[PDB]
Amino acid sequence: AEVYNKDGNKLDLYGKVDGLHYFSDNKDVDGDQTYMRLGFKGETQVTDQLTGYGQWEYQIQGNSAENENNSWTRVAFAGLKFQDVGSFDYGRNYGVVYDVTSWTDVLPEFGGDTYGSDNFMQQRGNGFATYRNTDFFGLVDGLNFAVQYQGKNGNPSGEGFTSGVTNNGRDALRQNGDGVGGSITYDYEGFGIGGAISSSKRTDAQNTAAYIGNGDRAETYTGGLKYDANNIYLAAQYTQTYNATRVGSLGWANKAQNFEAVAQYQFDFGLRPSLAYLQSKGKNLGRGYDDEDILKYVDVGATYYFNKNMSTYVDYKINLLDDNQFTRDAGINTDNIVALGLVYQF
């Protein structure tokens, strides 16, 4: 909702409450999953060509008792945009690989989980410096590219570490050395085609015997396709990764091949059914694991839109992973899940 628009400054205050419940034989995901998100997007006109902006988004879980608080910052960044040249922003933001993979992250509840948060340059993460050029100086409609740098996020401070520390340090599964990446997308009418590449130094804390997938750098290569017209949405992405994909709590995959596909239709009366397939196939994993499925599921669901502010959905994760030693060791969910959600948003 735009709550302020005066003398060239605009402020949009937005959010949602998702009354949400999971049904699953897996009791670690089963039960109340209610949550809310809040955010703001602000923009200020500096000149006719130059605009400054900032965005912040926060998630607060609504499913805990009052003696605890489970909340986090999704994004927080400030930036400058110049008409027909580009933009730059810095902060917690999305990695440029997400420019392509976001195209299949459109499912009612699940999806978008061949990668995670704080996972090199694949999704949300800290310390992104992002440069973007839209429409190639305004001379090629629909063609966009981006180049991104990520600074090191290392070991926690004040915990007795003698190397690799940063002020905002964290556990090794969520660390990263310096990284660089890029994306190109082209959209003509309904069609879209895109590609992205990322390369991040891996830290010493990540390259210990306690984690599978030791390596100097984490690399990702992504291609994507999209069709979005005539009430039909189709998209697919394929990603090859090296020492970049987490294998639950075990560490990372030496190599992984990720694939996601989605098909959706929008009825006039407000119903939007969705069908999707995701898989992540790991190779040469180490410790005798060899080749294993990290993720494999079919997602069938539907959303009903009452209007732009109220909707309800059901999403059914038909989980094709089988319960074995590998998935047990990594703590990967192999059970089906049904989600039922009712969402108010502004």
UniProtKB/Swiss-Prot annotation:
Binds 1 Mg(2+) per subunit; could be Ca(2+) in vivo. Disruption phenotype: Deletion of both ompC and ompF confers resistance to colicin E5 and to the toxic activity of CdiA-EC536. GO terms for biological process: DNA damage response; intermembrane phospholipid transfer; monoatomic ion transmembrane transport; receptor-mediated virion attachment to host cell. Residues 22-32, 64-70, 95-120, 151-179, 199-220, 240-248, 279-297, 318-337 are extracellular. This is Outer membrane porin C. Homotrimer. Forms mixed heterotrimers with OmpF and with PhoE; other mixed heterotrimers are also probable. Keywords: Cell outer membrane, Ion transport, Magnesium, Membrane, Metal-binding, Porin, Signal, Stress response, Transmembrane, Transmembrane beta strand, Transport. One of its GO terms (molecular function) is virus receptor activity. InterPro entries: Gram-neg_bact_OMP, Porin_dom_sf, Porin_gammaproteobac, Porin_Gram-ve, Porin_Gram-ve_CS. Residues 95-112 are annotated as: Loop L3. Mg(2+) binds at residues 319, 321, 334. It is a multi-pass membrane protein. It comes from Escherichia coli (strain K12). Pfam families: Porin_1. Its main location: membrane. Belongs to the Gram-negative porin family. Residues 1-12, 43-52, 81-85, 134-142, 187-190, 228-231, 266-270, 306-309, 346 are periplasmic. It is found in: Cell outer membrane. The chain crosses the membrane at residues 13-21, 33-42, 53-63, 71-80, 86-94, 121-133, 143-150, 180-186, 191-198, 221-227, 232-239, 249-265, 271-278, 298-305, 310-317, 338-345. Forms pores that allow passive diffusion of small molecules across the outer membrane. Gene3D superfamilies: Porin. Loop L3 (residues 116-133) extends along the inner side of the beta barrel wall and may constrict the pore mid-length. Induction: By growth in high osmolarity conditions (high sugar or salt) under control of OmpR (at protein level). In the presence of 0.2 M NaCl, 2.0 mM sodium cholate (bile salts) decreases expression from the ompC promoter; how this is mediated is unknown. GO terms for cellular component: cell outer membrane; pore complex.
